[PDB]
Amino acid sequence: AIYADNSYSIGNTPLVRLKHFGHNGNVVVKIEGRNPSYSVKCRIGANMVWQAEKDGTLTKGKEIVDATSGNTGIALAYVAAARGYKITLTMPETMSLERKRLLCGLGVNLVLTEGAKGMKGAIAKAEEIVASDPSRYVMLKQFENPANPQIHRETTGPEIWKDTDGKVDVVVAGVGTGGSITGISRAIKLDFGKQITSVAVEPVESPVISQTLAGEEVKPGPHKIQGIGAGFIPKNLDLSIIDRVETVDSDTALATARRLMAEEGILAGISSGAAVAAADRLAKLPEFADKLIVVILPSASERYLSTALF
Amino acid sequence: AIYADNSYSIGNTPLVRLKHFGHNGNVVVKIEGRNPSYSVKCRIGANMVWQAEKDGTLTKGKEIVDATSGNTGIALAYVAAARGYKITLTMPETMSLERKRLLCGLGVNLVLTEGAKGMKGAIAKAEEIVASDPSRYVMLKQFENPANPQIHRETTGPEIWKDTDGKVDVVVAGVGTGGSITGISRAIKLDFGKQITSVAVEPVESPVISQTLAGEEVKPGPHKIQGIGAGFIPKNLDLSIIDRVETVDSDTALATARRLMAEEGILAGISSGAAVAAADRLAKLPEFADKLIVVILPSASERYLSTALF
């Protein structure tokens, strides 16, 4: 029917079967680029705002404040515009002019912090702003807010169930906040009762989930897979529902995203390439031959125009 | 369920009710940016290829050749990648580096023509290529190919009918090829039998439909509303089903698109602003007060990052 604002238009994203990956069509992708603001983080922008409203922490006149380097800022920006909230986002001054223009265009009050301080500096400044009038400001905290995996339990997971008629056997998802793999997994395992294999994907350059689960020193490192590999275990990653962790390198992520574009006609982001590369490895193991593998593509590639992708 | 390739994922785009335009919620937008390749022209890229296959003009091994300055080239490029066709697109060398990179990334053979010749030069070169081996090449010709409005009759129109439960009274659409207003209108008027008002939108700078229908000299002119105002009456515009023509200026198109972003949280292209501006004019006339106005937003704005929009 007719959505009351664009926040309600999230999800119902398509599944497409891959032709040049997997073995006999065993790899299927969920195109979260096919969403408002071009990414999966429209679902959490919407639901974190919605839950804050229901719980009375976000009310008429209060202002959203958060620190955002990626897609959640774009998501919160469109949700705040659609629902009529002022919003201030902090981010380092190093951010691209194009991102700043997009955010400015969405009506955000942009507070640029010192370049040297990176994300710690922006998170600091956001917290500082909230401290300055905690009755005025609400910080939604995507790495810890349960409304993040909750929306994936209510929407993303049930969409995979329904569109595969319950035949999904494996879910492959890169982990940034962990919300996607957590909610999807809880839906399918707990609410639909199917003992699928849930596969976290992280960069080989920063394999903190693998290291954690091995009892090894956690050694984060730099990499180019935007949106994943935060270098710590976020509160919104439920390690209990993770069955396997696959590591992917940045070069192969990129190369895989390029192949999705050139060979499948799917315009997805670098982290989409990382997820597909991990899924293709599993898909070519005889143990996964008769299994339906659903892979989350978090974002679209026209958002990666000025990046190593293109 | 699961699409066999990304060509089949077209459409089922959302309707969102506007909060800061119209009068008591009478203006609703159809967000065709929520499509593969970010625009409405994924529907015609898909169906022109599909029809050419069914009619035996496009077969295994034959190459798509066309001349494209806008969104249809991006559409044909993703469809050709998804379905496994080679494709050559011609376009003037003046085109943006970003568009060229996108198209190169989609696997297109890009043939850049002389800048001075603009689109006539590219259309020439495409025709020249087809002439060089007409058994090898297929040019799909979006301004004349009936498969363009046919896909809108089969999909876009029926989606508006269903999502409004038949209550749509007015369709407002900018005209580039005319396919969208033609097919949508034929669907609703002919197949569902409702005598709605079909409104073409064109630039005030190049009001060739208005001039034509007035019996006046046709005087095209330059403007900035990308995707509409081709400066002629295309074969795919069925003037018989047009009830009214509204003209919109480029500055107000832009300003309207900016307002959609800032005030509604909808990221749409300049021609989306032109369509909304025309629809808002109609919506504030007492004759349209009790009428449901559905407005087509052809494309998304992250494709308009480096443009007057941002």
Question: Residue B91: beta bridge partners?
Answer: B112
- In angstroms, rounded to a whole number, what is the distance separating the alpha carbons of residues A300 and A297? 8
Residue A32 Ramachandran class (φ > 0 left, ψ -120 to 50 alpha, else beta): alpha
Active-site position among B37, B271, B272, B299: B271
CB atoms within 10 A of CB A258: 18
Cα B76-B78-B79 angle, rounded to 5 deg: 60
**B7 shares contact with chain A (CB less than 8 Å):** yes
- In angstroms, rounded to a whole number, what is the distance separating the alpha carbons of residues A157 and A180? 9
**Nearest residue to A4 via CA among B28, B250, B122:** B28
Contacting residues for A190 by C-beta, under 8 A, at least 6 apart? none
**B17 shares contact with chain A (CB less than 8 Å):** yes
- Residue A275 near residue A281 (C-beta atoms within 8 A): no
CB atoms within 10 A of CB B195: 9
Contact A264 B303 (CB under 8 A): no
Q: Which structure tokens are listed for A199?
A: 């596969």
| A:71-100 residues touching chain B, CB 8 A cutoff | 77-84, 98
Helices (H), chain B: 42-54, 71-83, 97-105, 118-132, 147-151, 157-163, 179-186, 208-213, 250-264, 270-283
Nearest to A101 among B5, B7, B310 (CB): B310
Contacting residues for A174 by C-beta, under 8 A, at least 6 apart? A180, A200, A201, A202, A225, A227, A228, A271, A274, A275, A278, A296, A298
Contact B101 A263 (CB under 8 A): no
Contact B34 A36 (CB under 8 A): yes
* Closest residue of chain B to A25, computed from CA coordinates: B4
What percent of the residues of chain B are helix, what percent strand, and what percent coil, each to the nearest 5? Answer: 45, 20, 40
**B165 shares contact with chain A (CB less than 8 Å):** yes
Nearest to A81 among B14, B31, B262 (CB): B262
Torsion angles phi and psi, residue A132, rounded to 5: -70, -20
For residue A36, list chain B residues with Cβ-Cβ distance below 8 A. Answer: 31, 34, 265, 267
- In angstroms, rounded to a whole number, what is the distance separating the alpha carbons of residues A18 and B66? 27
**Nearest residue to B261 via CA among B300, B306, B226:** B300
Q: Which structure tokens are listed for B207?
A: 């009001």
**B115 shares contact with chain A (CB less than 8 Å):** no
- In angstroms, rounded to a whole number, what is the distance separating the alpha carbons of residues A13 and B61? 32
**Exposure of A290 by Cβ count < 10 A (0-12 exposed, 13-18 middle, 19+ buried)?**
exposed
Contact B261 A81 (CB under 8 A): yes
- Residue B87 near residue B76 (C-beta atoms within 8 A): yes
Name which of B164, B302, B303 to mutate to probe chain A: the one with the most chain A Cβ atoms within 10 A of its Cβ: B302
Question: Residue A80: beta bridge partners?
Answer: none
Distances (CA, A) of A205 to A135, A245, A296, B12, B137: 41, 14, 21, 39, 46
Torsion angles phi and psi, residue B21, rounded to 5: -130, 165
CA distance B12 to chain A (A): 10
Q: Which helix (H) or strand (E) holds A52?
A: helix A42-54
Q: Which residue has the tokens 């599944």?
A: A15
- In angstroms, rounded to a whole number, what is the distance separating the alpha carbons of residues B65 and A301? 25
Residue B37 designated active-site: no
Nearest to A78 among B17, B84, B265 (CB): B265
Cα A29-A33-A38 angle, rounded to 5 deg: 170
The DSSP annotation for A250-292 comes to: HHHHHHHHHHHHHHH---B-HHHHHHHHHHHHHHTSGGGTT-E
Q: Which structure tokens are listed for A135?
A: 């009755």
Distances (CA, A) of A281 to A172, A201, B250, B277: 11, 12, 50, 50
For residue A78, list chain B residues with Cβ-Cβ distance below 8 A. Answer: 265-267
Domain A42-144 sits in CATH 3.40.50.1100: yes
**B216 shares contact with chain A (CB less than 8 Å):** no
Question: Residue B112: beta bridge partners?
Answer: B91
Contact B267 A78 (CB under 8 A): yes
**B144 shares contact with chain A (CB less than 8 Å):** no
- In angstroms, rounded to a whole number, what is the distance separating the alpha carbons of residues B271 and B148? 19
Q: Which structure tokens are listed for B188?
A: 């609703």
Any idea what DSSP says for residue B64?
A: E
Residue A271 designated active-site: yes
Starting at the edge strand found earlier in the chain, the sheet holding A168-174 runs A244-248, A197-203, A168-174, A292-297, A27-31, A15-17, B2-3
Contact A263 B5 (CB under 8 A): no
| A:281-310 residues touching chain B, CB 8 A cutoff | 300-303, 305, 309-310
CB atoms within 10 A of CB B118: 14
The DSSP annotation for A115-154 comes to: GGGHHHHHHHHHHHHHHH-TTTEE---TTT-THHHHHIII
Contacting residues for A263 by C-beta, under 8 A, at least 6 apart? A19, A20, B81, B107
- Residue B184 near residue B148 (C-beta atoms within 8 A): no
CA dihedral sign of residues B298, A44, B165, B44: positive
Q: Which structure tokens are listed for A272?
A: 């989409």
Q: Which structure tokens are listed for A279?
A: 């899924």
Question: Residue B38: beta bridge partners?
Answer: none
Residues of chain A with CATH 3.40.50.1100: 1-40+145-310, 42-144
Any idea what DSSP says for residue B171?
A: E
- Helix, strand, or coil (residue A308): coil
Active-site position among A7, A30, A37, A41: A41
CA distance A232 to chain B (A): 31
**Nearest residue to B307 via CA among B225, B231, B249, B252:** B225
**A31 shares contact with chain B (CB less than 8 Å):** yes
Q: Could you tell me which CATH class the domain A1-40+145-310 is placed in?
A: alpha beta
